[PDB]
Design a protein around this nucleic acid. Structure first.
Ligand SMILES: Nc1nc2c(ncn2[C@@H]2O[C@H](COP(=O)(O)OP(=O)(O)NP(=O)(O)O)[C@@H](O)[C@H]2O)c(=O)[nH]1
Ligand SMILES: [Mg+2]
Ligand SMILES: [Zn+2]
Lengths: 307, 141, 38
RNA sequence: GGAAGAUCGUCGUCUCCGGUGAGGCGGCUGGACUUCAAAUCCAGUUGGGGCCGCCAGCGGUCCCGGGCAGGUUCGACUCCUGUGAUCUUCCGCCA
RNA sequence: AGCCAGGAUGUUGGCUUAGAAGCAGCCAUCAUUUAAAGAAAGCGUAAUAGCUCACUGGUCGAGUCGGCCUGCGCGGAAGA
């Protein structure tokens, strides 16, 4: 039950994650030095039940957005934290628009700073969120008002957490993995961690690393802080792989997949959904899961476009 | 339609609807619809000839539009295009720009006579001609 | 404020005033014109 | 990835420039051009784009071009904010 | 002298056009509506808005405007 946390910066998203999981999202000294979530951090909630829900905390900053885009690949569920103090923030509305465009099956709104505000502000912000959901075309959403420092809404949140589907995947799909963080551990090589879009993998499997264009044997893997001999799509996957590839050629947003791709294409057609119409042949940022690109859009019939 | 707010007699040539480089935002600073300065802007434009820089009165209000009335073509350029010689001097005593006769400008100016001040027709006549003679042209007398 | 020995009027709002026996110039709208001891 | 920095013309280097873009310098391609050179200029680096007739293998349309976008501002390569890109240095990459 | 009000229109005015429109200037060096209206004496601004002023009215009620000769004083005038 992977739930990625998103929302405007410093509205308690880390406090919520320490409340549920107690994981320390910080890894780099700088984010420790600066106290903000400058870049993505992960939490996991292991249970006797044997499922481990995945938690991805992300910066709400636009310059840092390229990393959040690295984290939005493969989400099963999205939780947008909203502090009750100011209500929904503009960054939050931006993230909501980005989820509506990405076609995320469901999302939860979690209201924070509830203890500091009077209950009247609680109901008011609750109304405002329920109105905004209709604005974005959102269907079901379960609003939870909680002071995460107090643990107020935890029990109400639990039922929802168990409700969240894990995506099933058909056995017949070409294996596809989105690389995220490549960091060697002193033991056993590279171990690169990334979300698996489709397929299963095992240590004996050979993979094909894109952008380095090399086959790579899997040394080992951890499903979600859960070492195992095999890994299925729909979770973040630490993946330890061998092969001639080295970190200098490795890049975030490189694909690991079963068979050599035909070489990348610049031109592409895309269906458009937009809050307002785009204009022909104009420069813009293309943002894909773990991929930054710059390109010019062109208009074809109506909500059809050429990148 | 309401008390004084915006209007002054100023505009560019009638061929440029909502000019951007001399003006652009400056015309949109208040609440008149831009359409008045493009679509209704051509009303007096092609009514006579394209690109007559007639100043127009537009008292911008918050209450939809303001009455359109592009009135008096400026005398300065009118004494260029009507005389036919666009060139001049700017050196009134030091050179004589040229010469026209009473028959042209004194007849031309009467179209503005309803708006122009004067005690009699000739009060306007010498008033324009004292300006026109001071344009460096020595009109026939 | 400047102690220059010739404090000629500079703007219409400048006006001479004798304070503590020394004359001053104060241009109400334009502080820079303020002068001393003409 | 992050912080900060340099650069991103219209052939390159520089002076730049807020009044409408220009100039100094340079390499090369030739013409005027000599026995070759050298020099002088001229001519030129012709740029791209959505779209068009197209494969026309090209050529036009209109539009644009100081990387691109945005705002001033009355007017921007000119101011500035961004945006990336390349580039410099440094912070850490902890299943 | 205050107080209360005005202090135009053809005025983005010929050249010279970022734009100089009373507001460097080419040149404004007219005249006219009436009280004159400076094709403008200040500022505002790219120049117009904006306010002013000269200037022409109204309230007010007895003295008032700006110079010349001037005699005497003030600043300029800091050392052990
Ligand atoms: N009163 C109250 N304050 C809270 C609560 N939870 C968090 N906060 C406030 O939020 C601060 C911590 O915010 P944090 O969780 O680090 O922010 P973040 O949204 O995860 N950062 P990023 O958006 O970059 O990922 C605390 O200092 C605290 O003041 C709460 O339950 N009650
Ligand atoms: Mg955080
Ligand atoms: Zn003065």
């Amino acid at each position: 039950m992977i739930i990625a946390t998103a929302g405007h910066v410093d509205h308690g998203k880390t406090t919520l994650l320490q409340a549920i999981t107690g994981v320390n999202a910080d890894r780099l000294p700088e984010e420790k030095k600066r106290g903000m979530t400058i870049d993505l951090g992960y939490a996991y909630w292991p249970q006797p039940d044997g499922r481990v829900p995945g938690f991805i905390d992300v910066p709400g900053h636009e310059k840092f957005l390229s990393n959040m885009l690295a984290g939005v690949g493969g989400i099963d569920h999205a939780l947008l934290v909203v502090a009750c103090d100011d209500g929904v923030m503009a960054q939050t509305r931006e993230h909501l628009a980005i989820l509506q465009l990405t076609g995320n099956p469901m999302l939860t709104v979690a209201l924070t700073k509830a203890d500091r505000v009077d209950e009247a502000r609680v109901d008011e912000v609750e109304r405002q969120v329920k109105e905004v959901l209709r604005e974005y075309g959102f269907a079901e959403a379960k609003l939870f008002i909680t002071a995460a420092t107090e643990g107020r809404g935890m029990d109400a949140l639990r039922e929802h957490l168990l409700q969240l589907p894990e995506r099933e995947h058909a056995s017949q799909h070409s294996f596809r993995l989105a690389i995220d963080r490549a960091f060697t551990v002193k033991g056993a090589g590279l171990v690169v961690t990334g979300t698996a879009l489709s397929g299963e993998v095992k240590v004996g499997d050979s993979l094909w690393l894109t952008g380095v264009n090399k086959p790579m044997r899997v040394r080992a893997l951890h499903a979600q802080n859960q070492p195992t001999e095999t890994a299925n799509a729909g979770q973040r996957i630490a993946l330890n792989i061998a092969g001639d590839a080295e970190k200098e050629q490795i890049n975030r947003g490189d694909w690991l997949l079963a068979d050599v791709p035909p070489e990348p294409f610049t031109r592409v057609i895309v269906e458009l959904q937009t809050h307002t119409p785009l204009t022909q042949w104009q420069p813009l940022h293309i943002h894909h899961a773990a991929s930054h690109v710059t390109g010019r859009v062109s208009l074809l019939e109506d909500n059809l476009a050429e990148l | 339609a309401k008390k004084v707010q915006a209007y002054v007699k100023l505009q560019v040539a009638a061929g440029m609807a909502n000019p951007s480089p001399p003006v652009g935002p400056a015309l949109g600073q208040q609440g008149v619809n831009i359409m008045e300065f493009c679509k209704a802007f051509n009303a007096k434009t092609d009514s006579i000839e394209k690109g007559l820089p007639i100043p127009v009165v537009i008292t911008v209000y918050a209450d939809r539009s303001f009455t359109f009335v592009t009135k008096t073509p400026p005398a300065a350029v009118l004494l260029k295009k009507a005389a036919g010689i666009k060139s001049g001097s700017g050196k009134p005593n030091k050179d004589k720009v040229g010469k026209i006769s009473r028959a042209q400008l004194q007849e031309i100016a009467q179209t503005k006579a309803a708006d122009m001040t004067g005690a009699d027709i000739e009060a306007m006549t010498r008033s324009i001609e004292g300006t026109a003679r001071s344009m460096g042209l020595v009109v026939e007398d | 404020m400047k102690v220059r020995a010739s404090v000629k009027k500079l703007c219409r709002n400048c006006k001479i005033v004798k304070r503590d026996g020394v004359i001053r110039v104060i241009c109400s709208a334009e502080p820079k014109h303020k002068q001393r001891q003409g």
